[PDB]
Design a protein around this ligand. Structure first.
Ligand SMILES: Nc1ncnc2c1ncn2[C@@H]1O[C@H](COP(=O)(O)OP(=O)(O)OP(=O)(O)O)[C@@H](O)[C@H]1O
Length: 282
RNA sequence: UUUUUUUUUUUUUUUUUUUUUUUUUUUUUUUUUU
């Protein structure tokens, strides 16, 4: 059982498990609560491993069912166990990623049933983040399956984070990398300021951070409509000089070939293409 | 105003003909128009 901070390198354990299974000529099953992550992990594993066949089993697709490495959803595994598939006899490792996202009601019963129904020759690898309820999951699994499981945790984040506040064309650091609040900086922030964004607000930020070599930016707006307005407010700003635009255009043109000819003229596609040529997206 | 994609089961034909069942009897010479 591994419970480490985010961006600490949890995927190294899964890669080593897959390599061990390939060396022993056994099978591995990878499972995630969310179907969105399955495709991304499938692509990542296909790129990373060249001597190992990778498969995918979801409610929409089914690629290489006979491969030695399979990525599927929890309900797919539940149905497979209920049917009594013959490939389970060769499975050595089952990996559950993002365990801390399974504390829901619909996601909870299927996970417990899958854990209960698994045979005794299968070993477990568990990955998640730091959550208050960590020892209980491991204890329950080790009691139900009567197996030895080790709980491994990390002290702190390998990369540190800081919290700042922006006000009137400069940035005030108020929490440092040690998670210690700075009262004087907050007081100065209160003093210097003595509603919503304006039309000349996002340009005032896309230039200050650009000159500081901190360009890669993700802005969180809690509204579908406000994001489009904010993106449209950024006018006369570009990040592709002459070849990045051509490469992006080629990638977009090749990608949307799978659609029909009259389905590529939709306004959303045109607006996204126009925005993507300058390095801005929603 | 963020957040929400749900869809159950089955495999390759029973063996020996046509028959296919009820109310009681008689007597000695051609041809046409009559
Ligand atoms: N010991 C290490 N030293 C240097 N780099 C490392 C080390 N371990 C992992 N990395 C790098 O970390 C990068 C990404 O880390 P990773 O994706 O595993 O974080 P994570 O914990 O899985 O995030 P999440 O919470 O989303 O699951 C990898 O590309 C890897 O090169």
């Amino acid at each position: 059982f591994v419970a480490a901070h985010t961006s600490a390198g949890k995927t190294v354990v899964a890669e080593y498990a897959i390599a061990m299974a390939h060396r022993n000529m056994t099978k591995t099953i990878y499972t995630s609560p969310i179907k969105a992550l399955s495709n991304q992990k499938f692509r990542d594993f296909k790129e990373t491993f060249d001597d190992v066949n990778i498969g995918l089993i979801t409610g929409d697709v089914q690629i290489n069912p006979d491969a030695n490495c399979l990525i599927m959803t929890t309900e797919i595994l539940r149905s497979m166990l209920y049917r009594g598939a013959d490939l389970i006899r060769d499975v050595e490792f089952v990996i559950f990623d993002q365990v801390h996202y399974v504390n829901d009601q619909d996601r909870g019963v299927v996970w417990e049933e899958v854990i209960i129904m698994l045979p005794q020759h299968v070993k477990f690898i568990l990955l998640s983040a730091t959550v208050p309820n960590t020892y209980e999951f491991a204890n329950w699994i080790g009691r139900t399956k009567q197996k030895n499981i080790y709980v491994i945790s990390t002290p702190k984040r390998p990369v540190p984070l800081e919290i700042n506040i922006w006000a009137k064309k400069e940035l005030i650091p108020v929490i440092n990398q040690n998670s210690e609040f700075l009262e004087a900086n907050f007081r100065k922030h209160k003093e210097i300021l003595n509603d919503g964004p304006s039309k000349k607000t996002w340009p005032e930020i896309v230039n200050y951070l650009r000159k500081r070599e901190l360009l890669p930016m993700v802005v969180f707006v809690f509204s579908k409509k406000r994001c489009e307005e904010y993106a449209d407010w950024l006018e006369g700003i570009n990040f592709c000089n002459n070849k990045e635009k051509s490469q992006i255009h080629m990638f977009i043109e090749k990608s949307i070939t799978r659609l029909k000819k009259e389905d590529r003229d939709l306004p959303q596609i045109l607006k996204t293409r126009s925005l993507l040529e300058r390095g801005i997206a929603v």
